[model samples]
Structures are given as C-alpha cells and as structure tokens.
Target chain A: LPILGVLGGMGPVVTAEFLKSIYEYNPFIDKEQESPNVIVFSFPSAPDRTGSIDSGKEREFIDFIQVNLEHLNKLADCIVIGCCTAHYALPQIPENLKDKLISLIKIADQELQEYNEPTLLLASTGTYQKKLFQEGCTTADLIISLSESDQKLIHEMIYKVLKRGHDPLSILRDIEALLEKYNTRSYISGCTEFHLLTKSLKLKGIDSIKAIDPLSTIAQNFSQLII
Target chain B: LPILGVLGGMGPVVTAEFLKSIYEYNPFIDKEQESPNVIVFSFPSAPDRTGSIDSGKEREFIDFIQVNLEHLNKLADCIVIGCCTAHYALPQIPENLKDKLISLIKIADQELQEYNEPTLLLASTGTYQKKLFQEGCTTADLIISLSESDQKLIHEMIYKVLKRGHDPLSILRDIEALLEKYNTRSYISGCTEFHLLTKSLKLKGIDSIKAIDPLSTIAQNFSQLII
Candidate 1:
C-alpha cells in the first residue's frame, strides 16, 4: 500500500478529525495493520492563510508550505494537505511536491458533481480570492455565489470563532441564510474549519441539508487514492 | 522549539487521542502558530508487538521500529513511540535513533515517583514479559505485582476489548478487584490502551484511585521535553 503524507495543523483539531474520518470511513479491520500508513506533520506555527493574503505575505506562506511538503515528500507516496486554504500555495509548489498532492479542491470538484443545484462554498478569504475551488471545478457553474458582505461574515466566523475552539452552532444561521437565498440545500466545506459546523449540524439532527465536506470526500476516497 | 516526533499507530485511536492530549494539556494559544511542531507517523500496519514476541520474530519487530524511527529522526528533534510494549526494541535501536528517543518507560519511571504506595501496572503481555516498567522504575519496590492470570486478563482486555473499539468499562471490575487484592488504590497504565479504561472511570465519576497515565505524563511534560 502507498504511504499517505498529511500536511496538517492549519488547525490541529481539524487535522486530527480528518485522520479519524479516514479510518472511520473505511471498512472494519480485524487487525490494526489493515489500516493505512500515514505520516502527519501538524505544525500550527505556519502563518495564517487569510492573514498572510491580507498582509501581502503570500510568498512567505507558500515558503512554509513548500518546506513542509518537501519533508512529507521523502516518506509518503502521496500527500494531502489538511487545510483547503493551504491549497492556494499548490501552483507555486515545486513539481515533485505538486505531483504527490491530492488537492481538497479537486476532491470537492469531483464530489460536487452529485449536486445538480447550486451549492454554497464556505471557505477562508484567501481560498475564495485565489479561486482555488472555482477554477478547479468541472461543475463550476453550480457553485452558488455569495455577496461580498456574506463572504466577510463567513471568514470572520472561521477566524474569530471556529479556530478558537468555540462552539460553531452560531454559523448555522449564516449557512441557512445562504442556502435559503441561493435556493439550494447543499453546501461545500471549502474551508476545513466548516467541518466543525457540519459536525454540530449532524449532532443536532438538522443535517437534512447536503453538506459536502471535502475532508469527508478525501476520507471516503482514501483507499483508492493511496493505491 | 525542538520539533517533536511521534511514532504511533501501534493502535490508531489512542495515537489520535495522544496528539489531542498534547494540545489540550498545553496553555491556550491565541494563534495556532503558538503550538508546538509535531510530526507523527501513525503506522498501524506495523506487526503486533506482543504477537511478534510470542512468534519469536522480535528481530522483524525491531526492524520495523528502527526504520520508522530513522524516518522521524530526519525531521524531528526528539522521537517517541506510542506503544509501551514496543519499547522492547529500545535496546537494539541504533545509536542515532536512540539518542533522540524520549522513552515512555523512562517517563513512567520518573512519574511513578509521586505514588509511594504499591501501584499495579496494567499492560500488554509483551510489556510485562520484557519488564519494561518494572526494571526501569526507580520506585520498582512500589510496583504491586499481579498474578499470572490477572496479567493475562489485562492483556486480553487491551488487545481484545480496547483495540477493537469495544467499551472498556468491563475492564474496570478487573482493575477494582486487583486494587482490592493488592490493597493499593493506585495503578500505572503501562499500556496506552488503559487510557480508555481510565477515561471511562473519569466520565463515570468513579476516578478516586490515582491512575498514572504515562501518556498524560508525557503530554504534561511535552513543552519542557521539546526544548
């Protein structure tokens, strides 16, 4: 089996859950050895994705990602970044590191095919500005557009509330408002932080809406990709 | 800060929780950047520790650990293995890898100092057979001995119950009976799997007895050791 390299800790909690989701999605194994081999580097110290974009320090942010990617490159057969926004650095990443990457954006693009209707894409400011998901998606036309003000609200919610370990149930109103405005029951977690929002939604039994988490998309596809 | 290397996935769930524990035990960071850098290789596919010992294939087991340790050594300043029984390979580990290792056994020995009274040590068959905790402890005299059958029960509870995602509350009766037999309220979780048992005790409000989790000891002392 191919070794999986995870460049995580864009937020450690999400990364840990992402790893858990991988195993949880798989069929049961009688022995632990049947599980995947994963090398995870959770370095939360990397510069903030959105903050770096605002500060015009995207180059420095890219540098940090490249260095870590190089480290994972040595041992892992294929590499996946934990944070969606971190994928903004992918184009600038070296060809060798780029070759091994399984982009969350690409996974989102493929999984979003199941939804013919508009699907709200919730992500960090940097990811939206970079158009990482929009450009990569085959079903780009189905992506529901958010107003500038609403985008700011989602970004602030991610940075100010979710990343700080607060309960993310408050974001439900914003998500509901977007879904209602767009006339779609589906949304894409382009930002890994929104996994927390969906998890809260799942717990409350109000998860009738199709929340397509790219993290989950990657998790379900974990075995196939590794081979 | 020195980058911490964790060689885990002796069982994946406990390894995941251990990483979470490191972050949870630390002081809250205003920014994720303030957290320590950690590289974790969770390779559950490594041969079973106890199984290897019983099968007379300890050399193959050591080879697996040494190779992974070498991988961690390339990036991390110090390394730690997740399984207590896996410490059986410590003596044979190459000098370069061994130099950077922060042995769980050594940490258990040091942390065991607080409990002057006899403390039962619960672990895998391989860990006890190797006497990893018993020989390493400075307070070895305080380690209450278990009968052969009781040791087997604990081992089975670890491999059969906890490792397979079963409720570990069943192990509590055995623990309580052992404590009563030894007349000691304290116990040492030499195996990481006992973390689940102690967690069960904590949740049920029956955690009067001191359960010394070396995983917690390492997590508590994480910042200091990383330096």
Candidate 2:
C-alpha cells in the first residue's frame, strides 16, 4: 500500500506512456485490484526543458520544478519526474527532496552497469547539453556519445516524430544507422519519448541500455516498502 | 494519426474506468485529437473476474486478464484498458506497450461526468458489498436498495465500497432509512446491489430513481462508430 507520485508532462504523451509502462509491468492477481497505487500530476504548464536548453530560461524552468516538487512531495511517498532532460534541475531540487525523488539518471546508470555493454546514448539536446548521460555513465567503462549530426537526429526524433505522434520506425532506422556509424552494440533510450519508442520497436541484443522506467521500478520497490 | 486498440478485461473496472471513458471524453485542443481514437474489447474472463469477487485469488485473477489480451492485438494505434479492478494484473508484463490505459471506474466516471450530482452505479459485488463511500462518492447521489439483514448490506455495499478499495462502512441502515434517512432527493447508483438494499429498506423514492451511469448506453450506442 505504498503511494507513488509521478511528476509528468514534459510532453503529456510521454508522461502518460510512463504510467502505462507501470500498469503493463506489474499486473495484479485480481483484475479489480491490479493497479499500483499511484498519484500523477501531468502538468503541461511547466516551462519546457528543451526551451531552457536552447534559451537562458534556466531560472524559469528551475522555478517550475520546485513548485511541482512541493506539490508532489505533499501527495506521494516516493516521487519520479518523467522527463530525462528535466533531470538537469535535479541538483537544484534541494537535498532533502533528493531521497524522495527517483532519478532517471540513477536508474539508467544502474541498468547500464548491470548490462555492462558498450552502448550509445540517444537523447534530447537538453539532456546532452546537461551531460545527463555522461553523469549516468560515469561508473560504466564503455559508453559512446552520438556524433553531432546523430545528436540532432535524436532531438528531431523526439520533438518532431515521437512528440508529434508519428511512427518511430523511421527514427529507429536513423538510430540504427547512428549505431552503425558509431559501431556500438546497442543504444540507450535516454529520453522518455525514445523509451516509449523502444517499447514499440522491441530492440534486442542492445547492451547497457537503461529503460529508466521509474514508475515500474517504484511499483516493484513498493512491495518491499509496504508492510 | 495512429489508432489505439484496447484489450479490456471488462469486469467493469478496466473497461469502464480507463479505455471507454477516455475514448468518450478526453479534452484536447483539437476534437480529432481530443476524441482519443481507440478500439476496446471488454471481455470478462470467467475464472478471475468471478474468483476475485468470491474468493481472494488476487494473483490468478490478474494473470488471466494479462495473458488473454496483452500480445494478441498487434494492429492497435495505441491501447488502453480503464478498469481499476484489473490493474492487479500488471506484475507479469515484461515489456511496456505504447498507449494510455486509465483505471478506477469511480474515478474515471467522476472525471468524465465532472463529478455530476446524479447517483453513480458501481457494477461489482465488492464495491457494493463494502461501503467505501468517500472513495466512490464524494459529491454524488447515494442510493442503496432494501433487502434482508446480511444480504442487502453486503450486496449493495459490495459493489460500491469494495471496488473503491475500502471496507464496508455501515450495515444497519436500510434503504427506507436512507431515503427518509437523508432528506434529499431520490436514489442514484441503482445497480443490483443498491436495488437489493433499496427494496429491503422499503424505500419510497425507488421507482423515480435516476441511474446516472452511461456505460451501457455508451456501449450499446457504439460511440466509436461515429469516428
């Protein structure tokens, strides 16, 4: 009976997809009682993390994160922010709140270390600029960065293809090409949007790719936390 | 735009709460996008749906639903099943699918109807057997049928309270006592559970009662046919 709070809506679609991941992963015995106890705040009003990356609106973005954290902390026992780029503001979200917050960076890093494969990071420009993957893979010995053009392709895939609700197959093709270009064995779905596409594509044999699905992890962790 | 198909375990919870309602009424900037294009199959599994209602076989109940629906449908634009009761089946899933399935029938109905004042009909014995009033009804009409000592109370509240994830509240109060008990208008939430209680209590305003749920009406009308 642990309560989970979701901080969502970097793109409303991605936030929604994350919840779906939780429901899909941890099904219950009784159909009626199958859902994990979750509370979500899908606030589309938060200043765009991508906007902050492109512009100098870090203050506005940080303020947005702070307000949402305050609201989520009041309602949830454990909190998870849904976007990868938003992790940039993780340091600013206060040390006391750190334990309460489930970091995608940490989750990704853990999965990467476990898999121990040379992997490529595919994420948003914002996540790239903030070195989210670099920090996530600091412990892992083998992690390859995407080329500049590949990084731009990643950005375009998320905002243009995935966010626009288009098929991710073409984007995946581009990603596959990037993988070939980098000669890496696998890819990391660093952005939440890409994580969603990863589910659709079912990419296999990829190494060091952290799904970073905090909701699923939280649901699993809840059983241990709850009496 | 991609189409989302929902494979629902229609013990009323999964079907009613998330998929059907979202298809019916999710706000969007564009009506085309707002409609949440989806196809749902609300098939009630025999063993689990009935078992969960009678016995406490939570795990078996959820697994039945998941195995039946998860991978069978490949043509979905996206998928969602909206029942809170069926969420217990999420544990076995290994992969995340692309779609948004909502849960909790009462919550979904509440959100879609904007918490209208009319009575709400909860479809499960668990909900009626247990009188989890506040969870199911915060601001709506409260109606329970009249029946014998254990039969009426257990039946009515089982459908309302149990599904809402709470224990039954009060058993001694009769439907007549409820009608004359509360000096408001007529009865609402007029399912078999409430009907049994209302009849046992010899409630006066029974015939004039207005059942506010549009689920059956919505289903029979084939709301998706329009799209």
Candidate 3:
C-alpha cells in the first residue's frame, strides 16, 4: 500500500476530516487493515496563508511550506497539504517537489472534469485570488467566480463557520443561492472549509447541484494510488 | 503552557479537526509564542471502534489506546484521544500515567452544565452503550436521549454526512429535525463526527439551537489549563 503523508493544520479540524474521509471511502475486508498507512503533520503554528498574503510575508510562508514539504516528502510516499489557501505556495516550492506532492487542486480539477459540466469554484479568498483552480483547469468550461460580497461571505464562512467551530447551514444557504445565481449544475468545494459545509449539509441527489468534494476524492483516489 | 499529546487516527480526520479547533478557538495573540504545543500520533492502523464494539475486540482496541497513551504521556503535560469512540477504552488505560489526561466525556459534562438547557446527546452506538455521557452528566433534566430512530439516524449522519464529506447544511436539517423531535433547546455534538458538523454549520445571532461542541470547548479549556 502507498503511504500517505498529510501536511495539515491550516485548520487542523479539516485535516482530521480528510483522514476520516480516507477511512470512510476505503473498503476493507478486515476493518483494521482497511485504513491507510498515513502520516500527518498538523502544524497549526504554520503562518496563516491569509495573514501572509495580506502582509506581503509570502517569503516566510513559502519557507514554511518548503520546510514542511521537505520533511513530509522524507516520511511518506505521497504528500497532500490540507488547506486550500496554502495551495498558493505551490509555485514557490521547488519544482522537484511536484512529483512527491499530491496537489488538492489537481485532484479537484480532475474530479470536476469528470462531471463534464460548467463548474463553480467555492474556496477561500486567498485561494480565489491565487487562481489555484482557474490555473489548474485546462480542460474545463466556464469557471464561476464569487462576487466581492460573496468573497467576504466565503471568508467569514471559513473563519466563522469552519474555523470558529460554528454551524455552517447559513453558509450553505448562501452557497445554494450562489449556485442558483450562477445557473451552474455543480460546485467544487475547493476550500477545506467547504469540506465542512458539504458534510454538514448532507447534500445529495440534487442532480442540479453536483457538490464535488475534493477531500473525499483525494482520500478515495489516493488509496487506489497507494495500493 | 502544557503540551497536549494526541492519541489519534481513531479516524485521523477528526483528530486533525480537534487540533484545528484548539488553534481556532484559543489562538494566542503573540505570534512568537501563540498556539499550544501538540504532538499527534495519527495512527490509522488502530482497530476500528465500531467493528471492535460488535466483534468482542474491545480488548484489542483498549490495548492500542493504552500503548499510545503510554507513549504520549511521556511527551505531553496533558493528553487527549482524538476519537470519541476510543474513549471507551479509558477504563483499561492505567490511571497513574504521568500527564493529565483530558476526557472528552468530562468536558462535555461541564459544558452541558454551563448551557443548563435541556440538551440532546448525539453520538455513536458504542459511545451511547458505553454510557460515557450518561455517566458524565451529574445534573438532572439536562440530558436527553435520542429515540431509537434518531439514534440510527445519528449513526448514519456520522458515516454518510460528517465522515463522507457531505454538506454541513444537510446535516443541520437532520439535527434540526432531531432537536424539534426532542423539544430540546440544545444538543451535545457528542460524537467527534458531529465535531466536524458543528465547525461547518455555524451561523450568526439567531441562536435557536445551542450546540455543546465538546471538541472546541475541550480545545479552548485545555489551552487555559495548559497555559
């Protein structure tokens, strides 16, 4: 089996949720052996991506990611960073690191492509500004963008809803409204916070609303990659 | 500050979520010395709690928890088990261990008392059968049990909604329905799965329902205890 290394703690809770997703999606004949061989570095002390972005402390953040990536690469066969906003640092990390790193952005793009529909990107302001999804989608159609107000709401949803340990229904309602506004059939939960939103809402069978949860896909897909 | 050692991968995602909760709820203002020290043993190889509960593999599970606890007690000033179901093994862990072990059950009890409202308990069948919460609650009329159907639905919500990375809003609807059914003003997100649920679905003002989020409270409370 492939060993999975998680560079987590953008919001430590979401990283834990991602690991749970791995277990829930993987089927094991013997429950004990069914789970993955994983290593997680949930360093919440890592400088905040938003804080760094706003303050032009990108070098400090990049150095942090580079060091963590180097550490994680040595420990596991494949590495995944849990926070969406932190994906902005992907460019700053050395090019050689790409082969070892499992980009959530890449996984999300592939999953969105499978739907063959125009996709709506739901993510943090940092991730949105970074154009992580937009740059990753070479085979996609229209990529929906949140308005400035919606972006603020999304930011609030991350810190207030996901990070603050608050409920996320209001945010989902806002997302649903966004979906209707965009007239799109599917939305990519590009941010780790949205992972919380998708799970809390138990959204299903809304053929009109395809919620592509990258965390779930990464968990499931990585298992296959590992095996 | 006391070091918090985590015996984790009772589902790694939830464990990560718990740590994130710690940082989010009790972040330090001083960048140089902010955030609690945490050592997480994210062991996915640990036995499954649900399967062990049914198959008489409780001893196997208990042994694993003990082993991890022994290792963490050496490094941390306080310890917390990431998975709620794993709390069932508490009886087997030697009480004389050095570090202060923080119990989620105890934290829930204290927080529930503070809320002082009729509260419903939502957790795994194992947690319910273990009477972890029932044993923890000292006050009368504050604890409410879910009906048989609600119990099953709660279990399903853990796997299907919280664990599978579904939307939090969908989970809230189910939670709302349960709250209305029980005629309770609040509910204990008794399960770590529900920990993920609370983080995703938080809204402002309109406090129609109260969530006794044990993981968040524990994170916050433990920070104070440690610091």
Candidate 3 lDDT over B76-176, as tens digits, reads: 68777877777888777777763478777777888877777888888887777887788766843588988667788887777665655456568777788
- The candidate, 1 or 3, that scores higher on TM-score is 1
Q: Between candidates 2 and 3, name the one with more favorable DockQ.
A: 3
TM-score between candidate 3 and the true structure: 0.61
What DockQ, on C-alphas, does every prediction get? 0.67, 0.05, 0.18
Query: Which segments of model 1 are wrong by more than 4 Å?
Result: A168-174, A203-206, B167-170, B200-206
**lDDT tens digits, residue span A79-191, model 3:** 88888778888877888776777777777777767777777787777777787877887644657887777788777777766765566666667778888888886788878
Best TM-score goes to which candidate? 1
Q: How would the docking of model 3 be graded?
A: incorrect
Candidate 1 lDDT over residue span B161-209, tens digit each: 7877677797778778888988989888888877767777876998578
Error of 3 at A61 (Å): 1.1
**What fraction of native interface contacts does model 3 preserve?**
0.26
| Top DockQ prediction, candidate number | 1
Q: After superposition, how far is residue A73 of candidate 1 from its true place, in Å?
A: 1.8
| lDDT comparison, 1 vs 3, better candidate | 1
| Fnat: each model in turn | 0.74, 0.02, 0.26
Clashing pairs in 1: none
- Models 1 onward score TM values of 0.94, 0.55, 0.61
Candidate 2 lDDT score at position B104: 37
